[PDB]
Amino acid sequence: RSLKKGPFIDLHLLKKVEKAVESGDKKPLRTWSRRSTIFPNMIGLTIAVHNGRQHVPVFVTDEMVGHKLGEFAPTRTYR
């Protein structure tokens, strides 16, 4: 579907994740990277993807991986 090589993410978040990894599943993340793919070593994390004004939280689970973060933070509000 996109990018043959290297399920892309932005570094600041990677390290943010790593840091939380050894630190343990703790306080929710302040990622603004909706573009970053969700690597397996992120499950259980309660990262909060920015939403254009809101910074809505998302509780990662196995399946939430190849799918990019943006998918879990709908932008437009309808009805």
């Binding site: 090589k5 290297g6 570094l11």
Partner: protein, 100 residues
Amino acid sequence: AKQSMKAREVKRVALADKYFAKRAELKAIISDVNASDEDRWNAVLKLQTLPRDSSPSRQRNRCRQTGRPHGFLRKFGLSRIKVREAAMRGEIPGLKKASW
């Protein structure tokens, strides 16, 4: 349009040549089928380190006079309004209204 925008564009040109101009290599040879090792990953990960702009896709490219982002001609570097405005003046070398 808005001196700030034009300055913003040239800033893009500055950072453009300052980096990738001789550091597009990362996505180049490193993001290539030869070293799919962590090295290639280093590439895709060091690329972000580079300031957001600089990358050519982030070169909106405006008119050299008015600076109107739309209707720009890569040829004269001028927006249709100005290219016409000068062409009529007799400015542009050999450029009369065609009639084929």
